[PDB]
Amino acid sequence: LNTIDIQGDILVGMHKQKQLFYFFAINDPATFKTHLASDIAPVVASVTQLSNVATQPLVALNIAFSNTGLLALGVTDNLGDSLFANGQAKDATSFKESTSSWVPQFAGTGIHGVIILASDTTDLIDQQVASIESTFGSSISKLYSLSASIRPGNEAGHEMFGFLDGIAQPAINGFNTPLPGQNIVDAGVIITGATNDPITRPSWAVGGSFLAFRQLEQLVPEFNKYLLDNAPAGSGSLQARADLLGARMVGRWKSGAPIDLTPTADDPALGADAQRNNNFTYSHAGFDLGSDQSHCPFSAHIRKTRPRADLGGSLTPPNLSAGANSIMRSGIPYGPEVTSAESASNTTTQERGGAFVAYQAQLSQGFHFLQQTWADNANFPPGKTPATVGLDPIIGQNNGQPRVVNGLLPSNSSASLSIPQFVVSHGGEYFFSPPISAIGGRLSA
Numbered sequence: 001l002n003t004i005d006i007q008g009d010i011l012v013g014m015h016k017q018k019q020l021f022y023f024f025a026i027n028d029p030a031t032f033k034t035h036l037a038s039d040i041a042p043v044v045a046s047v048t049q050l051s052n053v054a055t056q057p058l059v060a061l062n063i064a065f066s067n068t069g070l071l072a073l074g075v076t077d078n079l080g081d082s083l084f085a086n087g088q089a090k091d092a093t094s095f096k097e098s099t100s101s102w103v104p105q106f107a108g109t110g111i112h113g114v115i116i117l118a119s120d121t122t123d124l125i126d127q128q129v130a131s132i133e134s135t136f137g138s139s140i141s142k143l144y145s146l147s148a149s150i151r152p153g154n155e156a157g158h159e160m161f162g163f164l165d166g167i168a169q170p171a172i173n174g175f176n177t178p179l180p181g182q183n184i185v186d187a188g189v190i191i192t193g194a195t196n197d198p199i200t201r202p203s204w205a206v207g208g209s210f211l212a213f214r215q216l217e218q219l220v221p222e223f224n225k226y227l228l229d230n231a232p233a234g235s236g237s238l239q240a241r242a243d244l245l246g247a248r249m250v251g252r253w254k255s256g257a258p259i260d261l262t263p264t265a266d267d268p269a270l271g272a273d274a275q276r277n278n279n280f281t282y283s284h285a286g287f288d289l290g291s292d293q294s295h296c297p298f299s300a301h302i303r304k305t306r307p308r309a310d311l312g313g314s315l316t317p318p319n320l321s322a323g324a325n326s327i328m329r330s331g332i333p334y335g336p337e338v339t340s341a342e343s344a345s346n347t348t349t350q351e352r353g354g355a356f357v358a359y360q361a362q363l364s365q366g367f368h369f370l371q372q373t374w375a376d377n378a379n380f381p382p383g384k385t386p387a388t389v390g391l392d393p394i395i396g397q398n399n400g401q402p403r404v405v406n407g408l409l410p411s412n413s414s415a416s417l418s419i420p421q422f423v424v425s426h427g428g429e430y431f432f433s434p435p436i437s438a439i440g441g442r443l444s445a
């Protein structure tokens with residue numbers, strides 16, 4: 001795996017406090033290509049660069065192109081991905097949402113790519129934007145942008161709902177040293193043209209990845225109040241019972257401890273330990289896999305997005321089922337922290353959420369499949385009792401309706417909750433993140 005040529009955000013992330021997603025159109029291909037090769041290609045951060053703390057740049061930069069952006073560059077080659085070529089807007093109905101609610105810019109194919117800028121101060125990002133806009137002139141044209149930031153203090157690495165994020169990623173066979181329980185996949189699941197990618201790619205695209213971007217707004221005070229109002233009756237404090245309902249929706253406590261390994265109370269020591277916090281398969285040698293929801297509901301978020309033993313394979317860790325449906329996640333929260341006024345009124349006023357970023361070699365096997373065939377599927381996982389699992393309580397969608405989620409209450413795996421959406425999609429786009437060599441090579445030719 002030629003790490004020198006792979007853009008850093010695909011495999012390790014930017015590792016910076018601030019990020020800017022700068023969505024652009026290409027107006028003058030000739031001038032754009034000139035500065036793409038002379039000004040962008042030399043500064044693109046690779047996996048090798050961002051892997052070592054020594055060689056981290058002041059401003060990490062990555063760049064990806066939509067289908068219409070590649071066309072605008074004169075690239076007519078088949079990348080091998082029908083979903084990429086049609087654009088995420090024509091795919092919205094697969095997720096039971098409407099482009100009528102999207103950010104107007106995403107509701108089309110006018111966006112030609114995204115520059116990802118990453119740095120520890122927003123001042124440095126603002127400088128690089130000016131620099132990029134002044135050298136490209138009008139050949140590049142900003143259509144939309146989204147500023148994002150790691151959350152402050154001890155909430156750093158947590159997403160807006162409070163849960164530690166970035167724990168579970170596929171390990172790439174031959175690249176990562178796998179952690180206990182982590183799926184182990186061929187490189188070609190993430191990296192186009194890499195080991196065991198079955199789709200033929202253009203040679204200049206070998207070493208890239210498809211980037212699925214989603215702007216996902218989170219209603220954090222609403223979510224916090226739903227947990228208190230629907231907390232399961234029981235022993236501990238009401239807050240503790242509320243946290244337990246939230247942990248059952250996600251499949252992890254806010255510390256990162258998986259409920260499958262500690263189903264009744266948090267354990268922050270476990271949540272922080274990468275040698276233990278993923279060492280599970282959902283199988284429990286004394287319980288029936290098809291009906292036991294006392295450790296983790298069938299509808300829990302992580303269980304719907306990585307089913308592990310719900311799809312067969314080893315009942316003891318590591319489970320390796322459905323390695324081809326793995327995605328690498330490089331998202332980052334956006335918006336202000338929740339304010340006093342919102343916290344006291346249980347109502348959001350300031351838009352916040354997650355800039356969702358998923359990398360995969362095949363969009364039909366990754367983000368799109370996870371969203372439509374698993375999370376939005378009331379009968380997935382299969383073979384359960386009761387068979388109606390319900391929807392993913394975090395990301396599950398059903399055309400704006402509240403979503404029926406089963407198995408969340410520990411006292412009764414048949415009790416249903418009708419849960420309003422706490423995550424609201426404002427849309428996004430499918431991009432191709434090319435290998436660095438293509439940026440000043442084919443894409444600049």
Ligand code: HEM
Pocket residue numbers: 159160161163164165166167168169214216217218250252301302303305306327353354356367368370371375394395423
């Ligand atoms: C605002 C929206 C979302 C929130 C708040 C959220 C939250 C989380 C959290 C807290 C975790 C556990 C931390 C971890 O495992 O690293 C997680 C894991 C995961 N999420 Fe989400 N997520 C969101 C959107 C999505 C979407 C749209 C998808 C895919 C369609 C997705 C796929 C996954 C996957 C694949 C995992 C890893 C599961 C595993 O390997 O066990 N997430 N997410």
